[PDB]
Amino acid sequence: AIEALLHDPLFRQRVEKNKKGKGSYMRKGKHG
């Protein structure tokens, strides 16, 4: 059970978007 659970998606690698980074450009801001 341990092994397959690990394989399952909920435990996929997470990466975050950047605010001053390379892939930063926000077309519309969170707030107007």
Partner RNA sequence: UACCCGCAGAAGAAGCACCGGCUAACUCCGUGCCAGCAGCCGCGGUAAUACGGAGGGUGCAAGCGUUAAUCGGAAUUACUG
Residues forming contacts to other proteins in the complex (CB under 8 A) are 1-3, 5-6, 10-16, 18, 21-22
Compute the half-sphere exposure of residue 21: CA atoms within 13 Å on the CB side of its CA: 7
Q: Does 3 bind RNA (CB under 7 A)?
A: no
DSSP character for 2? H
Q: Which does 32 bind (CB under 5 to 8 A by kind): other proteins, RNA, none?
A: RNA
Q: Which does 21 bind (CB under 5 to 8 A by kind): RNA, other proteins, none?
A: other proteins
State how far the Cα of 22 lies from the Cα of 30, in Å rounded to an integer: 19
For RNA (CB under 7 A), the number of binding residues is: 9
